[PDB]
Design an enzyme around this catalytic site. Structure first.
Site, PDB file in Angstrom:
ATOM      1  N   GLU A 189       0.846  -1.184   0.000  1.00 32.10           N
ATOM      2  CA  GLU A 189       0.000   0.000   0.000  1.00 32.10           C
ATOM      3  C   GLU A 189       0.885   1.237   0.000  1.00 32.10           C
ATOM      4  OE1 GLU A 189      -3.362   0.507  -0.220  1.00 32.10           O
ATOM      5  OE2 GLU A 189      -2.818   2.632  -0.294  1.00 32.10           O
ATOM      6  N   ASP A 212       5.020   2.246  -3.441  1.00 31.04           N
ATOM      7  CA  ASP A 212       4.245   2.162  -4.669  1.00 31.04           C
ATOM      8  C   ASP A 212       4.545   0.840  -5.361  1.00 31.04           C
ATOM      9  OD1 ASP A 212       3.075   2.461  -7.245  1.00 31.04           O
ATOM     10  OD2 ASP A 212       3.347   4.634  -7.162  1.00 31.04           O
ATOM     11  N   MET A 213       3.495   0.196  -5.879  1.00 27.59           N
ATOM     12  CA  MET A 213       3.669  -1.100  -6.525  1.00 27.59           C
ATOM     13  C   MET A 213       4.499  -1.003  -7.797  1.00 27.59           C
ATOM     14  SD  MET A 213      -0.040  -1.841  -8.248  1.00 27.59           S
ATOM     15  CE  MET A 213      -0.921  -1.195  -6.829  1.00 27.59           C
ATOM     16  N   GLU A 267      -7.823  -4.161  -5.968  1.00 27.07           N
ATOM     17  CA  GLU A 267      -9.139  -3.570  -6.172  1.00 27.07           C
ATOM     18  C   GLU A 267      -8.988  -2.129  -6.641  1.00 27.07           C
ATOM     19  OE1 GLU A 267     -11.356  -3.565  -2.572  1.00 27.07           O
ATOM     20  OE2 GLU A 267      -9.667  -2.995  -1.290  1.00 27.07           O
ATOM     21  N   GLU A 297      -9.330   4.717 -12.633  1.00 32.16           N
ATOM     22  CA  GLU A 297      -8.387   4.900 -11.538  1.00 32.16           C
ATOM     23  C   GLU A 297      -6.984   4.421 -11.894  1.00 32.16           C
ATOM     24  OE1 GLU A 297      -9.873   3.141  -7.997  1.00 32.16           O
ATOM     25  OE2 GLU A 297     -11.641   4.434  -7.862  1.00 32.16           O
TER      26      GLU A 297
HETATM   27  C1  LIG Z   1      -8.284  -0.131  -1.471  1.00 32.91           C
HETATM   28  S1  LIG Z   1      -8.864   1.043  -2.717  1.00 32.91           S
HETATM   29  C2  LIG Z   1      -7.395   1.118  -3.780  1.00 32.91           C
HETATM   30  C3  LIG Z   1      -6.126   1.189  -2.946  1.00 32.91           C
HETATM   31  O1  LIG Z   1      -4.957   1.011  -3.754  1.00 32.91           O
HETATM   32  C4  LIG Z   1      -3.994   1.958  -3.414  1.00 32.91           C
HETATM   33  N1  LIG Z   1      -3.126   2.204  -4.541  1.00 32.91           N
HETATM   34  C5  LIG Z   1      -3.448   2.835  -5.711  1.00 32.91           C
HETATM   35  N2  LIG Z   1      -2.452   2.911  -6.542  1.00 32.91           N
HETATM   36  C6  LIG Z   1      -1.412   2.302  -5.888  1.00 32.91           C
HETATM   37  C7  LIG Z   1      -0.073   2.061  -6.241  1.00 32.91           C
HETATM   38  N3  LIG Z   1       0.439   2.436  -7.412  1.00 32.91           N
HETATM   39  N4  LIG Z   1       0.702   1.423  -5.354  1.00 32.91           N
HETATM   40  C8  LIG Z   1       0.181   1.050  -4.187  1.00 32.91           C
HETATM   41  N5  LIG Z   1      -1.053   1.222  -3.746  1.00 32.91           N
HETATM   42  C9  LIG Z   1      -1.812   1.855  -4.640  1.00 32.91           C
HETATM   43  C10 LIG Z   1      -4.793   3.184  -2.978  1.00 32.91           C
HETATM   44  O2  LIG Z   1      -3.979   4.009  -2.199  1.00 32.91           O
HETATM   45  C11 LIG Z   1      -5.959   2.528  -2.227  1.00 32.91           C
HETATM   46  O3  LIG Z   1      -5.602   2.268  -0.896  1.00 32.91           O
HETATM   47  C1  LIG Z   2     -12.085  -0.261  -4.261  1.00 33.84           C
HETATM   48  N1  LIG Z   2     -12.599   0.944  -4.934  1.00 33.84           N
HETATM   49  C2  LIG Z   2     -11.907   1.730  -5.750  1.00 33.84           C
HETATM   50  N2  LIG Z   2     -10.656   1.564  -6.093  1.00 33.84           N
HETATM   51  N3  LIG Z   2     -12.646   2.722  -6.188  1.00 33.84           N
HETATM   52  C3  LIG Z   2     -13.911   2.606  -5.641  1.00 33.84           C
HETATM   53  C4  LIG Z   2     -15.030   3.421  -5.812  1.00 33.84           C
HETATM   54  C5  LIG Z   2     -16.193   3.074  -5.136  1.00 33.84           C
HETATM   55  C6  LIG Z   2     -16.222   1.936  -4.309  1.00 33.84           C
HETATM   56  C7  LIG Z   2     -15.097   1.125  -4.146  1.00 33.84           C
HETATM   57 CL1  LIG Z   2     -15.237  -0.255  -3.107  1.00 33.84          CL
HETATM   58  C8  LIG Z   2     -13.912   1.481  -4.836  1.00 33.84           C
END
Ligand SMILES: CSC[C@H]1O[C@@H](n2cnc3c(N)ncnc32)[C@H](O)[C@@H]1O
Ligand SMILES: Cn1c(N)nc2cccc(Cl)c21
Lengths: 299, 625
Positions: free
Chosen positions: B380, B407-408, B423, B432
Site C-alpha cells: 500500500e 508504490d507497486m 481492487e 483509476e
Molecule cells: C483499497 S482502494 C485502492 C487502494 O490502492 C492503493 N493504490 C493505488 N495505486 C497504488 C499504487 N500504485 N501502489 C500502491 N497502492 C496503490 C490506494 O492508495 C488505495 O488504498
Molecule cells: C475499491 N474501490 C476503488 N478503487 N474505487 C472505488 C469506488 C467506489 C467503491 C469502491 Cl469499493 C472502490
C-alpha cells in the site's frame, strides 16, 4: 342580504317587468355572489329598496330565468344552481346545487321547452341538464379549450350554439349521432345570439370587437367595438335591434345591416349584461362592474 | 407519506378554504392570487382607472402560510401569445403583475399553463421576470400528457378525430415544453406539472418525459373509476404511472370537483396513500443509495490522492464484493496447489493496494477454507492506511502478512508472486489507472502467475436527462474555463434519466498483459440504435470485471452484481444537447489518452450530429499517474 357585490354580472327582465340582478365579489376579503329581484327597476342597484335577495357561496358567472320564478345560476364552484321564488316572491330559496363541472361554469342557457338547459364551463365540457330530475342528461367534450358561450336555440329544443377559445363555433343538434357541427380562422368568438325571428340566423362577436352576421346555410360584419365583445342581445321589436356589449366600456345598438344607431359611454368599467324592457320596448337596461344600472332611451 | 396538494379555482374565504383543505389531509393549496374572472385593463380608458383593491390582502395569512401552503396560479384570461395586440399587451402587464405579486407573497411555486404550441411571448415574460432579481420561487408549467384537441370526443360531424396513428404527433405536448424551457435557457426555476388525462397515450409518449424535471403530477377527479363500495380507484395502467411518479417523489395535485358524492373529499387522497403503502420496499442497493439520487460527485483518484479513513470504511461496508474476492482466491489456490502438495507448496500472494486490509483478511479466509498455505505481502502506498495495516499486522496477523509501504510500480519485491490481488477499479473500470499500476507491478509476477482481477471492461450507454444536464451546467467555477464542467466525468447515482440504448463495451484490459503492444491508449467507436425520439445529454458509464474464471463483479444494470452497492455509474456529459429522431443512430467516439504524467478521456459525437471533441489534451480533466 345587506352588502351587494360591486361587480354586477347579469341583468335580466321577465314578463311583468321585474329586474333580475346577479353580482359577484371579484376582489376583497370574500369572493362570493348574490341574487336580487327588483320589481322597481329604477330602484336598482340600491339594496334597501329591493323585492328579494339572497347570498350565494361563490361568484355568479352567468344566469338566466327559468320561467317566471326560477333562476338558473352558473357558479365559480363548478356547480349549476337553480333558485326558485316562493309563492309570495319575497324569498329566493335554492332548488338544487349539483357539482358536475370540474372548473368554473362560464355560461348557461335554457332550452326552448324550459325543462332542459345547457351549461358551458372552463373545463372544456358542455353538459345538458334535466331541471326536473336534477341530473345531467349528457356531457360533451367537443371543444379543445375554455367554453366561452353557449346559447340555446330559441325554438328548437335540441339545437344550441357554442363557442370556445379553440376558435370553434359549433352548431349542436342532439337528434344526430354527432350533434356538433363546426361553422366557418379569425379571432376567437366571445358572444353568441340567435335571431329572434329567423331560425337559421345568428350573430357572434369576437375578442377583437367585430360583430358578424352568419347564415346557418353557409357574411356581413362590422367593427363595432375596440375590445372584446362581451354580449349580444336582440330587442323585442318586430324588426329587432342588436345591442352589443364590450370591454371598452361602451354600449352600441345596431340595426339590420349592423350599422351603429345608438352609442352609450355611461359605464366607467366593463359592461356585462343588457336586457330590454318588456313593457317599454324603447328602453334598454345595462349593468357593469362599476356597480351602475343605466336605463337607456333607445331612439 | 405522500406530499399531495389541492388545486382550486374558487376560493370564497382563504381562511375557510385553507382550513377545510387541510382538514381533508392536504399539504398545500393551488389557488389564484387574483380572481380568475377579474379581467384588468392597463392601457385604454376608462377601464384602467378602476379603483382598487385589485385582490385580497397579504394580511389574511401569515408569512409562514404563504411560504409553505399557498401555490400561485396564473389567471386564465391572461393570453400573452394572443393574436390580438391589445389583448397581448394587457396580458403582458397582467402576467408581470401576478408574477410580481406571487413573489411579493414569497410563494414557493407559481403555476403557468402550456396549452398550445406557441408560447414564445409567454416564455419571454417569464424569462424577463426571472432575471429581475435573484429570488427563490419555483415556476410549475402545467402541461398535459395529451393535448385537449387530441382527446376531444369524436362528436363533431364535419371534423372527425383522425384515427391514423402518428408517432411524432402524439408527442406534441412534450414539444411544447421542450421549446418553452429552451427559450428560457434551461432555467433551474422552471419545472413541469404534468397533467394526466382519462386516456393515457401510447407508452412511448409517456417515456418521453423521462429525465424531465417533473415536480408535480396533476390528477383530475374525472380520471378516477368507481369500485363496488363507490370509492375512487384507478386503472391498472394509471396505477403503473402513479408508481413511476413515486420514484421521482413528485407532488400529486388533485383538481376538479367531488364526483364521488357520498365519499367526502379525502377519499381520493387515501387511495394514493394506499398505493404508496403498497409497493416494494428498497433493496440494499436502493436503500444505501437513497439521498444520492442525481447527486454529482468527483471520481475518486486513489493513486494521485490518499483516501481518507471513512472513504476506506465505505469500501469495507460491502460483504458481497469481498465474498467474491475470497471466492476467487479460494478457487485459484486449489487450481495451483494440488492435494498432494497441500502441505509443501506455499503460494506467494501480493495484495496491491491493500488499503486498511479487507483483501488481506479475505485472502486469509480463502486459504483457510481451501486448506492451503500462503505468504502475504500487503503493498500500500497511502502512508495513512499503512498505519492501519501495521496495527493489524501486529495485533492479529503477525509474521504471516508482510506490510510494504511503497508504490507497486517502484517497489522491488524480494520474491515473485503466484497471485496478485488488487481492487484498483473505479466506476468506469480503468478510470483509476488500474492498467498502469498492474503493468508497472507486472515484473515481480511469476511467468505462470495469476492476476485477480484477470480482466475488466467499461460500458457506455447514451442517456437523456434534462435534469442532469442542468446539474452539470450549474457547475461552472470562477477561475477556470466556463465550459470545463462539461469536459469531466462525474460519479452519480443515475435516477431521473432515460437510457436511450443498451450499453456496449468500450475499453477492455487484460492482466497479465503479455502483448508486445503494451499501450493503454484506446480509441473506440460505438453506434447506438435509437428507437425513440429524444434529446441526447450524455453517456452513462459502467464496468464489468473478471476476478477469476466465473467469479465476476459488475455494475452493468443487466448483469449487475446483486447486493453490491459500492459503485455508482459514471457520467460523461456533452456541451450542447443533441436531438435524436426515432430510428437514428447515435455514434460516439471515445479516446483514452495518456502521457508520462497524466491519463485522460476524450470523447465526441459524430452521428446524427457532430459535437465538439471534449476534454482535448485533458485541458479540463486529468488522472494523475
Ligand atoms: C483499497 S482502494 C485502492 C487502494 O490502492 C492503493 N493504490 C493505488 N495505486 C497504488 C499504487 N500504485 N501502489 C500502491 N497502492 C496503490 C490506494 O492508495 C488505495 O488504498
Ligand atoms: C475499491 N474501490 C476503488 N478503487 N474505487 C472505488 C469506488 C467506489 C467503491 C469502491 Cl469499493 C472502490
Amino acid at each position: 342580504p345587506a352588502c351587494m357585490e360591486r361587480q354586477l354580472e347579469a341583468a335580466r327582465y321577465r314578463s311583468d317587468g321585474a329586474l333580475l340582478l346577479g353580482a359577484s365579489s371579484l376582489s376583497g376579503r370574500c369572493w362570493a355572489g348574490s341574487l336580487w329581484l327588483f320589481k322597481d327597476p329604477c330602484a336598482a342597484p340600491n339594496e334597501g329598496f329591493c323585492s328579494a335577495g339572497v347570498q350565494t357561496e361563490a361568484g355568479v358567472a352567468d344566469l338566466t330565468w327559468v320561467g317566471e320564478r326560477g333562476i338558473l345560476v352558473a357558479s365559480d364552484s363548478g356547480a349549476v344552481e337553480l333558485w326558485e321564488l316562493d309563492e309570495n316572491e319575497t324569498l329566493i330559496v335554492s332548488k338544487f346545487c349539483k357539482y358536475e363541472h370540474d372548473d368554473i361554469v362560464s355560461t348557461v342557457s335554457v332550452l326552448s321547452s324550459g325543462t332542459q338547459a345547457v351549461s358551458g364551463s372552463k373545463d372544456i365540457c358542455i353538459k345538458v341538464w334535466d331541471l326536473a330530475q336534477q341530473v345531467v342528461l349528457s356531457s360533451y367534450r367537443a371543444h379543445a379549450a375554455q367554453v366561452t358561450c353557449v346559447a340555446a336555440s330559441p325554438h328548437k329544443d335540441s339545437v344550441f350554439l357554442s363557442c370556445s377559445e379553440d376558435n370553434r363555433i359549433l352548431l349542436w343538434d342532439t337528434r344526430c349521432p354527432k350533434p356538433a357541427s363546426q361553422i366557418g380562422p379569425g379571432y376567437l368568438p366571445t358572444s353568441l345570439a340567435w335571431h329572434p325571428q329567423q331560425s337559421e340566423v345568428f350573430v357572434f362577436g369576437d375578442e377583437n370587437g367585430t360583430v358578424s352576421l352568419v347564415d346557418t346555410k353557409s357574411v356581413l360584419s362590422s367593427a363595432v367595438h375596440s375590445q372584446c365583445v362581451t354580449g349580444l342581445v336582440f330587442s323585442p321589436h318586430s324588426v329587432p335591434f342588436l345591442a352589443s356589449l364590450s370591454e371598452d366600456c361602451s354600449l352600441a345598438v345596431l340595426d339590420s345591416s349592423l350599422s351603429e344607431l345608438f352609442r352609450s359611454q355611461a359605464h366607467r368599467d366593463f359592461v356585462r349584461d343588457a336586457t330590454w324592457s318588456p313593457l317599454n320596448h324603447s328602453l334598454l337596461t345595462t349593468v357593469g362592474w362599476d356597480h351602475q344600472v343605466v336605463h337607456h332611451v333607445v331612439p | 407519506r405522500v406530499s399531495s396538494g389541492r388545486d382550486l379555482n374558487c376560493v370564497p374565504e382563504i381562511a375557510d378554504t385553507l382550513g377545510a383543505v387541510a382538514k381533508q389531509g392536504f399539504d398545500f393549496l393551488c389557488m389564484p392570487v387574483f380572481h380568475p374572472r377579474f379581467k384588468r385593463e392597463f392601457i385604454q380608458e376608462p377601464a384602467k382607472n378602476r379603483p382598487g383593491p385589485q385582490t385580497r390582502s397579504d394580511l389574511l395569512l401569515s408569512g409562514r402560510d404563504w411560504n409553505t401552503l399557498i401555490v400561485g396560479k396564473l389567471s386564465p384570461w391572461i393570453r400573452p401569445d394572443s393574436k390580438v395586440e391589445k389583448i397581448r399587451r394587457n396580458s403582458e402587464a397582467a402576467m408581470l403583475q401576478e408574477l410580481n405579486f406571487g413573489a411579493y407573497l414569497g410563494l414557493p411555486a407559481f403555476l403557468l399553463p402550456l396549452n398550445q404550441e406557441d408560447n414564445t411571448n409567454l416564455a419571454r415574460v417569464l424569462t424577463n421576470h426571472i432575471h429581475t432579481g435573484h429570488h427563490s420561487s419555483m415556476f410549475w408549467m402545467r402541461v398535459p400528457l395529451v393535448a385537449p384537441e387530441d382527446l376531444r370526443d369524436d362528436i363533431i360531424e364535419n371534423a372527425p378525430t383522425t384515427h391514423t396513428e402518428e408517432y411524432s404527433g402524439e408527442e406534441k405536448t412534450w414539444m411544447w415544453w421542450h421549446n418553452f424551457r429552451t427559450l428560457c435557457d434551461y432555467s433551474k426555476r422552471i419545472a413541469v406539472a404534468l397533467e394526466i388525462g382519462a386516456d393515457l397515450p401510447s407508452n412511448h409518449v409517456i417515456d418521453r418525459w423521462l429525465g424531465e424535471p417533473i415536480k408535480a403530477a396533476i390528477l383530475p377527479t374525472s380520471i378516477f373509476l368507481t369500485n363496488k363500495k363507490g370509492f375512487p380507484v384507478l386503472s391498472k395502467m394509471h396505477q403503473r404511472l402513479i408508481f413511476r411518479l413515486l420514484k421521482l417523489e413528485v407532488q400529486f395535485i388533485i383538481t376538479g370537483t367531488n364526483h364521488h358524492s357520498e365519499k367526502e373529499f379525502c377519499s381520493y387522497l387515501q387511495y394514493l396513500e394506499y398505493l404508496s403503502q403498497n409497493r416494494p420496499p428498497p433493496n440494499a442497493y436502493e436503500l444505501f443509495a437513497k439521498g444520492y439520487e442525481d447527486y454529482l460527485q468527483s471520481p475518486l483518484q486513489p493513486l494521485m490522492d490518499n483516501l481518507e479513513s471513512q472513504t476506506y470504511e465505505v469500501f469495507e461496508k460491502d460483504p458481497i464484493k469481498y465474498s467474491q474476492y475470497q471466492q476467487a482466491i479460494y478457487k485459484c489456490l486449489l487450481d495451483r496447489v494440488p492435494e498432494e502438495e497441500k502441505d509443501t507448496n506455499v503460494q506467494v500472494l501480493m495484495v496491491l493496494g491493500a488499503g486498511r486490509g479487507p483483501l488481506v483478511n479475505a485472502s486469509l479466509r480463502a486459504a483457510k477454507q481451501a486448506d492451503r498455505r500462503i505468504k502475504l505481502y500487503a503493498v500500500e502506498k497511502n502512508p495513512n492506511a499503512v498505519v492501519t495495516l501495521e496495527n493489524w499486522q501486529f495485533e492479529e496477523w503477525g509474521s504471516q502478512v508482510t506490510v510494504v509501504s511503497s508504490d507497486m510500480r517502484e517497489w522491488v519485491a524480494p520474491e515473485k508472486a503466484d497471485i496478485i490481488v488488487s481492487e484498483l477499479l473505479g466506476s468506469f473500470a480503468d478510470n483509476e489507472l488500474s492498467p498502469e499500476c498492474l503493468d508497472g507491478a507486472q515484473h515481480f509476477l511469476k511467468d505462470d502467475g495469476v492476476s485477480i482481477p484477470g480482466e475488466y471492461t467499461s460500458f457506455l450507454a447514451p442517456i437523456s436527462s434534462s435534469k442532469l444536464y442542468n446539474e452539470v451546467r450549474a457547475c461552472r467555477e470562477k477561475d477556470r474555463d466556463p465550459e470545463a464542467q462539461f469536459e469531466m466525468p462525474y460519479v452519480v447515482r443515475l435516477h431521473n434519466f432515460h437510457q436511450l440504448s443498451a450499453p456496449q463495451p468500450c475499453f477492455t484490459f487484460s492482466h497479465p498483459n503479455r502483448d508486445p503492444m503494451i499501450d493503454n491508449n484506446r480509441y473506440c467507436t460505438l453506434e447506438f440504435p435509437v428507437e425513440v425520439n429524444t434529446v441526447l445529454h450524455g453517456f452513462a458509464g459502467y464496468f464489468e470485471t473478471v476476478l477469476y474464471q466465473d467469479i465476476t463483479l459488475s455494475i452493468r444494470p443487466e448483469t449487475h452484481s446483486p447486493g453490491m452497492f459500492s459503485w455508482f455509474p459514471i457520467l460523461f456529459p456533452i456541451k450542447q444537447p443533441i436531438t435524436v429522431r426515432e430510428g437514428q443512430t447515435i455514434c460516439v467516439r471515445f479516446w483514452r489518452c495518456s502521457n508520462s504524467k497524466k491519463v485522460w478521456y476524450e470523447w465526441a459525437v459524430t452521428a446524427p450530429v457532430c459535437s465538439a471533441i471534449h476534454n482535448p489534451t485533458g485541458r479540463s480533466y486529468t488522472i494523475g499517474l
